[PDB]
Amino acid sequence: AQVINTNSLSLITQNNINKNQSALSSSIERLSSGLRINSAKDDAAGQAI
Amino acid sequence: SEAQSRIQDADYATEVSNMSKAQIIQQAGNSVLAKANQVPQQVLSLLQ
């Protein structure tokens, strides 16, 4: 390597995890609940209708 | 008599589906909780 201080490669891999983790949390919450919407962080039109 | 029975009656065919639905949701919740409890586990190999 060339840099002894910071590993921005691990930083990029770290950024990769959280975006998948959000969809992960959505998936478990949707499996547990009977409803797909479930207090819509997504479109509110579906929840209202 | 028929009026009072109609006003409050179990009407089995309706709530049988409800109880089956509730049991299915409960089992699904237990399964998904068992699948989701493993999320913090991967940090162990990270340490050493």
From Swiss-Prot, chain B:
List locations, semicolon-separated.
Answer: Secreted; Bacterial flagellum
Hey, which family's this protein in? Belongs to the bacterial flagellin family.
Q: What does this protein do?
A: Flagellin is the subunit protein which polymerizes to form the filaments of bacterial flagella.
What's this protein's name? Flagellin
Organism (species)? Escherichia coli O127:H6 (strain E2348/69 / EPEC)
